[PDB]
Amino acid sequence: KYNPQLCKIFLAISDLIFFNLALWFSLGCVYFIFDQVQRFIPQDQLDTRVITHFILSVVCVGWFWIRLRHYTYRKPFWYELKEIFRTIVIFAIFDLALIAFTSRYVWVFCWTFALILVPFFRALTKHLLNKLGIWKKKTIILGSGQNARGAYSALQSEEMMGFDVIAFFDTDASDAEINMLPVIKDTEIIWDLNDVHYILAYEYTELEKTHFWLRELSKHHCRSVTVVPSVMLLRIQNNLAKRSSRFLKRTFDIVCSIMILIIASPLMIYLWYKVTRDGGPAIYGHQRVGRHGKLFPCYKFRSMVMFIRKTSLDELPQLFNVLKGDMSLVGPRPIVSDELERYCDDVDYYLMAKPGMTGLWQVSDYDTRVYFDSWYVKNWTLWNDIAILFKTAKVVLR
Amino acid sequence: KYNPQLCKIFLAISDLIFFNLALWFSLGCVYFIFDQVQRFIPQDQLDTRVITHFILSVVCVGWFWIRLRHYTYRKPFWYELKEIFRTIVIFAIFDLALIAFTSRYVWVFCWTFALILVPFFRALTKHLLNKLGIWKKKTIILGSGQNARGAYSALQSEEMMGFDVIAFFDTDASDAEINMLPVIKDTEIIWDLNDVHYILAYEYTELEKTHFWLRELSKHHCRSVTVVPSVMLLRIQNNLAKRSSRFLKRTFDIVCSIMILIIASPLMIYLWYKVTRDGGPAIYGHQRVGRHGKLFPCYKFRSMVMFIRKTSLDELPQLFNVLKGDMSLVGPRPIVSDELERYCDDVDYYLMAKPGMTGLWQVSDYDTRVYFDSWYVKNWTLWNDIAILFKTAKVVLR
């Protein structure tokens, strides 16, 4: 039932309408709290101002349609969110330049509103549109090994893109069921299926096959093609080796930890009162390996004798720890010194960054955790920290 | 004697000074031809306007320093030049918008001046620094096969980059001289050399070695690293399959052919008068394979009985061909139908695009020409057309 043009039209309508609604909400709040905007913006400005905003609005959708191509190619939720935030803050810079060259409060209100609402309302409209069933588009995976099934699992890791993997294909598939999906070996089925999207996930040793398929989908002019690997210049950015990144992470850690301490102090104090009925220290320090291999006392709610565990509140006192600098909010899970050997050659990756209360594996065996922590350390960004923190809050809620 | 800090400082100073000098030149020309700018821009504007320009200027260098990194990483002259034009035209949108919310002639004059002068004067500055010996930085190549020597030759293809290859390295090198350069097999020489840049050019079958070297340059913290190959998403853009690109190429071809006709009509008419002394057609049509395999009469100056060839003027009448659509300026060299077989599986690539007066191989055996033409067809851009046309004019001059 997949329908691309209706999706694009609805998404553009949502973008324009809600981008205008941000400024209208700013106007309404200013009127409700101050009662006079003619005080602030005289009347003859309005139309002029608003039409300028209209122009900006269409420019925004233009930058999202013909340059960033949000309406023809699909990205995960978080990459979309980061790109949209960068675009909209750059647009806020544009409008600040326009206004300064001609109010701060109305500008801040409108654009904070926009940042909050445009992605959330895009999510709402795409969810309703998925409920309408023209969002999910049918896809065929090529490959019958671990790479294909892992990519399939990655696709189900976030349904909001709408890739419905309907069937697999591999001329030499050992099984008939991959992840309980039908397997196609005679390619005539594939070509008779032609709005069918394709995902190439052949393994490295079969990469040559992909090259053949790289030609195949070109011959019948199939534009919906995507390949996921198992004179070019790739710059691997070791972000954790930058002093500016470390200082920014320290500042963000301090601010967020202080804020959440302010938020959750009553609950922690109530837990203190309830636990201290036995007469002992409700908070204990356990030795763990931290940054550079440094041994630190992690502070935790006491769980044993001289409900919290199910709710996972026992990790709350670590914020005091974060107040001193031993760990961040986002990072590898703390482990004992005996568990260090299981990292093997990745030990250096485990010791390069401060540990975190939450990490990639917490929200996504021991080797899987080690690989996820190493990937987080190698590809650390502040955006990744925000995403992992939001996912951790989501997990806590569910 | 290589010096990065002096080069960066000089390049920034040149960029800023000449960006301001563009506006000063616009002011001077407007004054010389009009005699009154107070007519146009009153006096109290000047300082305000100029300081805004000053701000824009530093913004420009900022956008070239911390975002585009033109001062720490080296790019080919044409990629640099295209990126600089894109930056300047985006800034043109900026400044035209800034003026709109508050003259067309002065703005156009000033920033055509900037567009012409900033790249050319930056080139003059880096050539002067090359004469001063702080531009060429010493580089070590890794690899002893065809890929290493090919990357070496492609590096000498643009000496303005500033990469002086001083020695090779390969533990298993068969020879002692690669391109007559010294070869190292004990890496202790390389680590004793440590401002030494590195170029990894190991072949695909030895790619594993590069991975080891990928670690090696990491452990000694050598940040001057570069690799040239012999979940990622690579979108191969077949530009020639786009109707908009084809129409743009048609319009550009028409305009450029018309202007070349306007410029070169006296020379062509004179050569007509000189050749027609024998009483025959100075212009002849030779059958050649064109777009889609279409056979077309290519127009050429007559060279045989019933100086021009040395000067290569005999290819001038093909402009008339370009006027009808069988020829472009930039494209594969026209060949006879017997030469088609030598393209082999690449024949389809030879037939997809209109033949041009000049091509990539003309300015850069038969197989090399076929590969260059196929690469041009696959990776065609209007910027590539401009670069090849400029290189062809350069070749004609030399």
Residue numbers in the entry:
A (entry chain B), B (entry chain A): 7 to 108, 113 to 204, 208 to 243, 262 to 337, 375 to 432, 438 to 471
From the study:
O-antigen biosynthesis in Salmonella enterica serovar Typhimurium LT2 is a well-studied example of a Wzx/Wzy-dependent pathway. This pathway utilizes a PGT known as WbaP (formerly RfbP) to catalyze the transfer of phospho-galactose from UDP-galactose to UndP, forming Und-PP-galactose. Finally, large monoPGTs (Lg-PGTs), which are the most abundant, include both a predicted transmembrane four-helix bundle and a domain of unknown function (DUF) N-terminal to the monoPGT core catalytic domain. The S. enterica WbaP is a prototypic Lg-PGT that has been biochemically characterized.
The structure presented represents the first monotopic PGT characterized in the native-like membrane of a liponanoparticle. Subsequent masked refinement and cleaning of particle stacks led to a moderate-resolution (~4.1 Å by GSFSC) reconstruction from 196,663 particles which was consistent with the AlphaFold model. Docking and real-space refinement led to the placement of 796 out of 1056 residues of the dimer. The dimer interface comprises ~780 Å2 of buried surface area, involving 7.1% of the residues of the protein. A modest (176 Å2) interface is found along the four TMH bundles, with the C-terminal half of helix 3 (Ile99 – Phe107) mediating contacts. While the C-terminal regions of helix 3 are within interacting distance, the N-termini (Pro82) are ~32 Å apart, creating a large void in the center of the dimer, which is presumably occupied by phospholipid. The catalytic domains of the Lg-PGT protrude away from the dimer interface, placing the two active sites 77 Å apart. A predicted helix-turn-helix motif from residues 337–369 of the catalytic domain is also disordered in the experimental map.
